[PDB]
Amino acid sequence: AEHLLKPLPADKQIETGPFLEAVSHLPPFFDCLGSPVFTPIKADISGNITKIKAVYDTNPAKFRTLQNILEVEKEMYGAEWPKVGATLALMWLKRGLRFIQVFLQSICDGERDENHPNLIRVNATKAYEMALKKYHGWIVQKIFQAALYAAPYKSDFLKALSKGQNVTEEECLEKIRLFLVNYTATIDVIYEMYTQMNAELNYKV
Ligand SMILES: CCCCCCO[C@H]1O[C@H](CO)[C@@H](O)[C@H](O)[C@H]1O
Ligand SMILES: CCCCCCCCCC
Ligand SMILES: *CCCCCC
């Protein structure tokens, strides 16, 4: 399974190449939601992955780790850093990754609206509220909240995730949990790197 992330090494330095390779399998899974109304969250994650790749691909040795990108871009472009280039793209990407995490985890934990137990709208909304909303002005909130309102049925979403293979609903859930392990750990380290490096900005778009 190629969306599975590597374990963290002991020094916690995330290698850019394998990271980019693994998360770039995430955007296509937005199609499992069904609707093309979710293209805003999908396209955003995607675009940020591409911008980080654009920098990385110019010089994989120098941009070997995620930390390298931040330190090097600070050297190249001190006045505007961290509001620059791949540093900024990763700043936004982590929030989108956290959104996905907290969404999936909430599903696995079995949180639900008792009034609408086969939807995943509460899961999406809680994910958006904790990960992204505080960084979005009203117009972008309008866009993201319209789309969450097309959240599919839980059973459909899970059936869709496990297409091509023969796997029960709680086998599919077991697979989500497994993915969440190194995925969650990596996200935590990215957030922590942003705080440690004074790279975190809180403006709204
Ligand atoms: C898919 C449309 C939703 C817009 C969300 C916003 O975030 C963007 O904001 C910054 C500009 O400050 C870009 O650098 C990011 O790449 C992007 O996610
Ligand atoms: C929000 C859509 C992203 C889903 C990612 C799930 C991948 C891991 C489970 C197979
Ligand atoms: C089918 C088109 C939906 C477009 C939303 C950006």
Author numbering: 5 to 209
How is this structure described in the published paper?
Mammalian glycolipid transfer proteins (GLTPs) are potential regulators of cell processes mediated by GSLs and display a unique architecture among lipid binding/transfer proteins. The 23–24-kDa GLTPs display absolute specificity for glycolipids, are highly conserved among mammals, and include plant and fungal orthologs that have been implicated in programmed cell death responses. The liganding site consists of a sugar headgroup recognition center that anchors the ceramide-linked sugar to the protein surface and a hydrophobic tunnel that accommodates the hydrocarbon chains of ceramide. Here we report crystal structures of human GLTP bound to GSLs of diverse acyl chain length, unsaturation, and sugar composition.
To search for additional conformational states related to the GLTP working cycle, we cocrystallized GLTP with a model compound, n-hexyl-β-d-glucoside, in which the sugar headgroup was β-linked to a single short (six-carbon) hydrocarbon chain, rather than a two-lipid chain ceramide moiety. GLTP binds the entire ligand at the protein surface, with the hydrophobic tunnel remaining closed and containing extraneous hydrocarbon for apo-GLTP. The sugar headgroup of n-hexyl-β-d-glucoside binds the GLTP recognition center in a manner similar to all GSL-GLTP complexes reported previously and in this paper. The same network of multiple specific interactions are observed between the n-hexyl-β-d-glucoside headgroup and the GLTP recognition center, with the only differences being the following: (1) the absence of hydrogen bonding between K55 and the glucosyl OH4 group because of its equatorial positioning and (2) the loss of hydrogen bonds involving ligands carrying the ceramide amide group and residues H140 and D48, which are now water bridged to each other. In apo-GLTP and the n-hexyl-β-d-glucoside–GLTP complex, the tunnel has collapsed, although the bottom (represented by cylinder 2) remains occupied by an extraneous hydrocarbon. A disruption of the H7/H29 stacking is observed in all apo-GLTP structures in which the H7 residue is resolved, including in our D48V apo-GLTP, as well as in our n-hexosyl glucoside–GLTP complex. In contrast, on n-hexyl-β-d-glucoside acquisition, there is only limited outwards movement of the α helix 2 N-terminal segment and adjacent loop L12, but no movement of the α helix 2 along its axis nor outward movement of α helix 6, keeping phenylalanine F148 in a swung-in position and allowing for only partial opening of the hydrophobic channel, in a fashion similar to that observed recently in GM3-His6-tagged bovine GLTP complex. Comparison of the apo-GLTP and the n-hexyl-β-d-glucoside–GLTP complex provides clear evidence that the recognition and anchoring of the sugar head triggers conformational rearrangements of the gate region, L12 loop.
